[PDB]
Design a protein around this ligand. Sequence first.
Ligand SMILES: OC[C@H]1O[C@H](O[C@@H]2[C@H](O)[C@@H](O)O[C@H](CO)[C@H]2O)[C@@H](O)[C@@H](O)[C@@H]1O
Ligand SMILES: OC[C@H]1O[C@H](O[C@@H]2[C@H](O)[C@@H](O)O[C@H](CO)[C@H]2O)[C@@H](O)[C@@H](O)[C@@H]1O
Ligand SMILES: OC[C@H]1O[C@H](O[C@@H]2[C@H](O)[C@@H](O)O[C@H](CO)[C@H]2O)[C@@H](O)[C@@H](O)[C@@H]1O
Ligand SMILES: OC[C@H]1O[C@H](O[C@@H]2[C@H](O)[C@@H](O)O[C@H](CO)[C@H]2O)[C@@H](O)[C@@H](O)[C@@H]1O
Ligand SMILES: OC[C@H]1O[C@H](O[C@@H]2[C@H](O)[C@@H](O)O[C@H](CO)[C@H]2O)[C@@H](O)[C@@H](O)[C@@H]1O
Ligand SMILES: OC[C@H]1O[C@H](O)[C@@H](O)[C@@H](O)[C@@H]1O
Ligand SMILES: OC[C@H]1O[C@H](O)[C@@H](O)[C@@H](O)[C@@H]1O
Lengths: 139, 140, 140, 140, 140, 140, 140
Amino acid sequence: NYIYSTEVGGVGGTPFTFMQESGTITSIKFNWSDQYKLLHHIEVKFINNANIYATGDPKGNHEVILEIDDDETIIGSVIGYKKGNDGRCTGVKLTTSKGKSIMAGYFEESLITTYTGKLAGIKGGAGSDIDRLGLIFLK
Amino acid sequence: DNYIYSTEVGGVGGTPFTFMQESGTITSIKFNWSDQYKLLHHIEVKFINNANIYATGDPKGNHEVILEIDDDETIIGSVIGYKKGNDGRCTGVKLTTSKGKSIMAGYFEESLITTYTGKLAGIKGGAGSDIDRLGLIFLK
Amino acid sequence: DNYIYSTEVGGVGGTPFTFMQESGTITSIKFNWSDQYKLLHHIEVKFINNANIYATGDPKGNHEVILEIDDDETIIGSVIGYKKGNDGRCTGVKLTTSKGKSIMAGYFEESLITTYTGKLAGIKGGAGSDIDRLGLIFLK
Amino acid sequence: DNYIYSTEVGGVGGTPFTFMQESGTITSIKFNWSDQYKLLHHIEVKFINNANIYATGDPKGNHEVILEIDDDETIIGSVIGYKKGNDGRCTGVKLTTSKGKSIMAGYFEESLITTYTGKLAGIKGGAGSDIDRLGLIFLK
Amino acid sequence: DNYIYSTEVGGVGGTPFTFMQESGTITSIKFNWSDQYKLLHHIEVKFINNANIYATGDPKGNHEVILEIDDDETIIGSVIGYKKGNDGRCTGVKLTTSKGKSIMAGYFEESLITTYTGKLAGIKGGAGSDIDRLGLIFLK
Amino acid sequence: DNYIYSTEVGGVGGTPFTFMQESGTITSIKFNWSDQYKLLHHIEVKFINNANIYATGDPKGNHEVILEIDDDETIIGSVIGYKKGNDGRCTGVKLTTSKGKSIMAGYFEESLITTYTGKLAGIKGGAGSDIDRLGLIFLK
Amino acid sequence: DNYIYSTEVGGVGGTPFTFMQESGTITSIKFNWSDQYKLLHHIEVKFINNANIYATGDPKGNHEVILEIDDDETIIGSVIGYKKGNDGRCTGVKLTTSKGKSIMAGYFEESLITTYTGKLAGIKGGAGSDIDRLGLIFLK
Ligand SMILES: OC[C@H]1O[C@H](O[C@@H]2[C@H](O)[C@@H](O)O[C@H](CO)[C@H]2O)[C@@H](O)[C@@H](O)[C@@H]1O
Ligand SMILES: OC[C@H]1O[C@H](O[C@@H]2[C@H](O)[C@@H](O)O[C@H](CO)[C@H]2O)[C@@H](O)[C@@H](O)[C@@H]1O
Ligand SMILES: OC[C@H]1O[C@H](O[C@@H]2[C@H](O)[C@@H](O)O[C@H](CO)[C@H]2O)[C@@H](O)[C@@H](O)[C@@H]1O
Ligand SMILES: OC[C@H]1O[C@H](O[C@@H]2[C@H](O)[C@@H](O)O[C@H](CO)[C@H]2O)[C@@H](O)[C@@H](O)[C@@H]1O
Ligand SMILES: OC[C@H]1O[C@H](O[C@@H]2[C@H](O)[C@@H](O)O[C@H](CO)[C@H]2O)[C@@H](O)[C@@H](O)[C@@H]1O
Ligand SMILES: OC[C@H]1O[C@H](O)[C@@H](O)[C@@H](O)[C@@H]1O
Ligand SMILES: OC[C@H]1O[C@H](O)[C@@H](O)[C@@H](O)[C@@H]1O
């Protein structure tokens, strides 16, 4: 019942997989730096669940939060990254079925335009930086 | 509840405030901010069928904006700018309505939240000299 | 009432005025303003079925705009620029209508209100050499 | 009446004129203007079922525009540029129609009116060397 | 008649032409103009169900444009540029159709007419070396 | 016939060509052109249910574009650039389709035609070294 | 067939490749390109219900883009840039989807094709160091 968007970036970091069965993401936060031009930290909240699921080191000078209504889908989703085994996530642009949008970080090397739908989860690897990030949707 | 609570953004400082009125919605909201500090300093809210002005923070800035909200008019677009961390502050609010009205108060230099939308019902957070933290409240 | 009263913005100065005619609406309004002082100085209003011209302020400014309003035309966008505080003044008005007509008078360098919308019935406030204060009035 | 009179804008100077015909609407209108003075100098009008040209003003300008109006075509947007005061003059006309046709005559540097909309039926004002003052006339 | 005659614009010079066919409409029109004189010089017109080319003027210009018109396609926008006066000339034509097709011929440096609209049925005016004068003709 | 013939624009030179297939529409068209001469030099065409390539002119140009046409896709906009006269040439083609596809080949510096529209069925004209003339063919 | 083959554009060089799966469509496609050479160098494709990655060409470029395609998502706009001739190369791709998604890879300085549209089923062409030749394949 889930669609796994391609994980983009490098092979480094501590693995993460955040997905509650019968739930969807109600809030997502991205943390990035002007110093490295990288995403560093991600936080996620699910419906009817106050717990925050986090990865990465929140050392960046900027963060954006997107709140998602229960009937709201992602209709546009771009992740910017540096490719190769030594790849990092650099940016994210999300647009919703209600015209809400967020833009984090930088888009200077490689891009992926992912699958659309109801955002259910995230998987990847993170340490000091977001090495790699894949979105997960409902089928 | 019958209400959606958007995340409070900013620091942990100042005196807590909650502005909500049983079976009531915001008909008017006022933001005060300074070019000197690039922060919101003061917020004022009025509800439908209630002439009382509910205020928090110190009205010391050189700019103010007021948004009046028709009884049927909703928020379709909402951004709050803030400085993140325990020591944080709310720096700015952009609202757009179901009738093409829009306001821009203060600054959006550090962190942003794109909040939940709907019929604006209340606000909560903390304030003293400054708005330390701000979260919107909507009907279901 | 059968009226919505938008906030009076600006100072407490000048002679009070209320332009409202029972069972009538504003067919014409005129805004006079100066580049010298960047203030509104003078406002005239004509109502439906009334040849009488209601005026307030001193027509001292070097610019004037007139908006004519069709009987079935409403305001869908309204911003008033003003200097806040007791010594305040109303500095500018932008109006847009249900038919794509729009006017822009004066300056928007200090505070702003995005008012209520609807069928413009009347205006209230205070004036002398300048428009000290302006509130719009709409039908429910 | 069965008519709407838009405000005559400009000066008190020149010979008065009123162009209207029983059960007849404007089928054509011409505006003469100069780059040297940036005024309207001359207006001509033809009515439905009437080959007579009604003209006023001194046709001395280096530009002219004609708008032809289909029998079922209305004015949806109408801006007249003018210099305010007793020594005033009409400086420009922008008209936009129900079928997307549009003309621009003259200059818009001092004062503007956005008039009423509808089926153009006549014009009135005063002209000598220049168009001192112009008001539009529409069916109810 | 069953015809609308748009104003003939330009001077009184050259040889008269009138191109119309009973129960027919313009399927093609060609405008020849020059960068040297910034004038139209030559016009050709073909009618529905008729192989004949009706031409007037001197084809001496360095540019031509052709608009082909589908049987159900009307003119929704039509602008003719000209020099006014007895010694006048026709300088350009812009036409836009019910299908989004358009053409621009020549220059719009002096006077302009926004014409009547509808199904293009014919043209009349005067021509010699130049197109002195041009009017359009439409069905009712 | 069951076909509409757009005007052949260009000159009288080259070898004639006519590309049409019984019960067959154009599925692919290629334009070759030079920056050196600012002309079309070569055209290739394929029809529905037919793998043969019909070609004319010499492919000496440094640019090509291909348009592929879905079976239900029509041309809603079509401009051919040319040099007029007996020694004329085809210089450019702009096509826009019912699905928002569009190509632009070559140059539009001298003369233009906006052609008939519909389902492109074939082409005719003449070519040798260059495309001397080109006319489009559509279904009724 | 049940397949529409767009023209393979570019050179005759490289190792031929054909990526198609019986009763399957493309779910992901990656283009790798260089600013140094302004060519595509490498392509990867994944099909519905199939975890295998089909690659061709040499991934030596400094940029990559991935377009993921929803199961019901089609191609409504498709341009490939290329150098024509026996010695040719693919230089760029633009894809636009039924859902407002788009990618742009590489360069468009010489020749273009606007291909057929629909549900993208596969690709074919040749590749070694570079993408010499690319053709898209759609469902009927
Ligand atoms: O710590 C285990 C983890 O370390 C290595 O990845 C890096 C670190 O997590 C940290 O320093 O930050 C780097 C940037 O975020 C990150 O690449 C790898 O050896 C990895 O495989 C391992 O899991
Ligand atoms: O809202 C800001 C801040 O206000 C209050 O703390 C301090 C005092 O108001 C005053 O003495 O000036 C200080 C410098 O601006 C100010 O911090 C408290 O309400 C505090 O908790 C709050 O964060
Ligand atoms: O409208 C502003 C102001 O106008 C009137 O006072 C005027 C000003 O104070 C100043 O221009 O000096 C004038 C000369 O004596 C004076 O009229 C008053 O109506 C005031 O109440 C009003 O605020
Ligand atoms: O159409 C222009 C003009 O053509 C004919 O006379 C011309 C003018 O004298 C002048 O512009 O130069 C021409 C070159 O020899 C000359 O013929 C007449 O038909 C005239 O009435 C017309 O205005
Ligand atoms: O279609 C252009 C032209 O091509 C052929 O003549 C050519 C030109 O004179 C010139 O470019 O030189 C060429 C090679 O030496 C020569 O063939 C003819 O087909 C002619 O009819 C045509 O108009
Ligand atoms: O029209 C401008 C001007 O022209 C003339 O000098 C007279 O007709 C005046 O009465 C008039 O004000
Ligand atoms: O892709 C460029 C080039 O790469 C290799 O050298 C071979 O497969 C060639 O035939 C090809 O043209």
